[PDB]
Paper text:
We instead adopted a ‘Lincoln Logs’ approach that alternates non-polar patches that favour close subunit–subunit interactions with charged polar patches that disfavor burial. We hypothesized this would generate offset arrangements of the monomers, generating fibers with empty ‘pores’ in the regions of the polar patches. We generated such fiber designs from the C3 to C6 designs described above. We characterized the three-dimensional structure of two of the fibres by cryoEM. As with the bounded designs, the cryoEM model backbones closely match the design models. Like C4HR1_8r_shift, the pore size and twist closely match the design; the twist is −142.8° per monomer, or 71.4° per repeat. Notably, C3HR3 was verified to high resolution for the bounded four-repeat, bounded eight-repeat and unbounded fibre designs. While the radii of all fibres are comparable, C3HR3 has the largest repeat size; thus, the mechanical stiffness of the monomer may be responsible for the increase in stiffness.
Author numbering:
A (entry chain C): 1 to 465
B (entry chain A), C (entry chain D): 1 to 159
Write the structure that this text describes.
């Protein structure tokens, strides 16, 4: 009698009705007949396990699952569907009465892509991989217990199909213990986070990217539980110390989303330089707070910190107790940006110069020895040259080419150091003349560019002015 | 109404949205409007050459190209953007239905350094050189014919 | 972790990588390990003088200087390289923070022949002559004041 009820519930669905009508027209009636035979057999295989019948009702009421089943019975792979329903029956039986775990199954099997992936994994004769994976699910769910935040994170992580594929791949390779260790690390991360919406939100965001999850699995595979635990502790501390300020939390979410920054953070948390990362996050907080809501400076900070090499340089410099050098450098950058105002062509040169990591290392070196006014006057001379370029774009293009080179910038800082500032000024306007004399004859501009761009001829030319 | 489609596809990109927000912040309200006027003009210059407007949907939906265009409209070189979009149109109509040649154009104009170099060469009133060079590209493509190894070398060497 | 940055920057150079691989082949692995130990020791002997770390990042990046250092570590002259790096550290520390003088040192030590002559002159236990000569360089640079003609002539003559 239950089979007739299930058949009726399936047939009364309008989408199912339209699909069945289409498949009746196209001559595939025996495919529908085989599918209903499989449904009857699945009901008879469930028997007195009424929770399995309640699962099948939900699974077949969904029209997309029914459409996938029709496509998969058509091509003669109905035995794959029988094997899948047998495995699902075994998984629901072995759980017994864990209603939260059966709720997780009712959720995961309703999602079409998960059902398609499971069908594909049951076709190629890898049934034990699905069995082991459902066992791991039940185990992690029982371990979670009275801690609904962790079960919510687990449900969200499993709903993502890419993470589901990664989990199936790692279970296939018999890395089950690595997966168990990872869920234990998630448990001892959620327990530590407690009720704090920002930290739980950061976990919910970060753990959802496949790259970060793959990196985490690749580190816990080599028995590195302490590394991951201390990294989550450092992130919790960074959120707690951040206070209420959206612009810092945004940078944390961004930088931690970037995979290579997360790799560098793991490498520096392993070697017991944890307090270095703490002080670095403090320095970022100070830079953001002292840089107000000025969007130009904030964008410059985001571009500078998003680049991994500059991030590593900053880590190495806070490592050896020179945090105040980084602070003074960010102060000089903020000062230079404030004098730029809305003159976007000049701010573009700050973006180009500071985006080059070698020039950032040189600037940190030049600020450390307390020559900061040299850098200040050099930025002012760059402004007093760009503002004099006016509307002549080949000059500014030559200047973009010239200042990107690290050794030319070093030589310019050297000539500003020894008190010959005016000569540097006289150089830049002189270049303007060679442009204005050049006009539109690109061969002369090309020759001038080949004479300017190399360091030795540059230092020679600086000596003749 | 394809202009509205272009606007939606352009502002949908998050980096483009960030750039536009920044350019609204620092007090350059009219520069975004001038750029969108140039975009509207470029759309209505294509007319029924739907492949050209598809090429514009490609080019303008790239953060680097769009930022370069904004900065290059800033300091009064607006017309340099109008001229360039004209010449590309001349390159597309004269190119005809050689879809592989339009593929090479899509590849080349996506690279920001190529687009900046072309902006420099159209700025100083050497547009004829860019037009002749696109003609050389078309001719080398037709001469190469259906022989994809040579077209791959051509793509790499011009990239 | 600065030492790791030096190792990565050194091994990024293809020529240095090939030299290391070749010396791995011939059964001289402990010579490469001893050289890296000397590098570590000189770095941690430099301390918080980041200018000295920059000098080591420059001098050791050069492939010929690395080759000469490796060959001098081969035949049992490790202490000679250690003494030379110590003397360079002392000349940078006593040199103060005159950036032009440190530029002269960065120039003169990048030249391979000057480095080989200094190694030969530290080998024979004449350590103080090198330090005295660096003192003479410091004095001549500080006496030149701001007059780049003379500093250019001096760089040329000492090169």
């Amino acid at each position: 009698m239950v089979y007739e009820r299930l058949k009726e519930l399936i047939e009364e669905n309008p989408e199912i009705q339209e699909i069945l009508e289409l498949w009746k027209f196209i001559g595939r009636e025996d495919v529908v007949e085989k599918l209903f035979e499989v449904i009857k057999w699945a009901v008879e295989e469930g028997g007195n396990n009424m929770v399995f019948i309640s699962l099948l009702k939900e699974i077949l009421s969904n029209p997309e699952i029914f459409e996938i089943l029709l496509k998969w019975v058509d091509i003669g792979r109905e035995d794959v569907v029988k094997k899948l329903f047998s495995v699902i029956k075994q998984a629901v039986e072995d759980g017994g009465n864990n209603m939260v775990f059966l709720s997780l199954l009712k959720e995961l099997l309703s999602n079409p892509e998960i059902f398609e992936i499971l069908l594909l994994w049951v076709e190629i004769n890898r049934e034990d991989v699905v069995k082991k994976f459902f066992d791991v699910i039940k185990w992690a769910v029982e371990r979670g217990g009275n801690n609904p935040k962790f079960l919510s994170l687990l449900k969200l992580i499993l709903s993502n199909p890419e993470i589901f594929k990664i989990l199936l791949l790692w279970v296939y390779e018999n890395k089950e213990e690595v997966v168990k260790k990872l869920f234990d690390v998630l448990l001892y991360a959620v327990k530590e986070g407690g009720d704090n919406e920002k930290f739980l939100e950061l976990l919910k965001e970060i753990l959802s990217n496949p790259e970060i999850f793959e990196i985490l699995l690749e580190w816990v595979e080599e028995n590195k539980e302490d590394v991951v635990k201390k990294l989550f502790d450092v992130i919790k501390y960074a959120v707690e110390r951040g206070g209420d300020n959206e612009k810092f939390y945004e940078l944390l979410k961004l930088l931690l989303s970037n995979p290579e920054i997360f790799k560098i953070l793991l490498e520096w948390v392993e070697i017991n330089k944890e307090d270095v990362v703490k002080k670095f996050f403090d320095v970022i907080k100070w830079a953001v707070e002292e840089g107000g809501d000025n969007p130009v400076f904030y964008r410059l900070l985001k571009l500078i910190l998003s680049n991994p090499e500059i991030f590593k340089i900053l880590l190495e410099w806070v490592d050896i107790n020179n945090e105040d050098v980084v602070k003074k450098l960010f102060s000089v950058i903020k000062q230079a940006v404030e004098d730029g105002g809305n003159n976007m062509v000049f701010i573009d040169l700050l973006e180009l110069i500071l985006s080059n990591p070698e020039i950032f290392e040189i600037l940190l070196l030049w600020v450390h020895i307390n020559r900061e006014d040299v850098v200040k006057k050099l930025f002012d001379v760059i402004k007093w040259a760009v503002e004099d370029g006016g509307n002549n774009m080949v000059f500014i293009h030559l200047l973009r080419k010239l200042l990107s080179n690290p050794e030319i910038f070093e030589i310019l800082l050297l000539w500003v150091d020894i008190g010959r500032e005016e000569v540097v000024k006289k150089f830049f306007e002189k270049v303007l003349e060679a442009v204005k004399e050049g006009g539109n004859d690109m061969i002369e501009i090309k020759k001038l560019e080949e004479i300017l761009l190399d360091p030795e001829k540059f230092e020679e030319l600086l000596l003749e002015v």
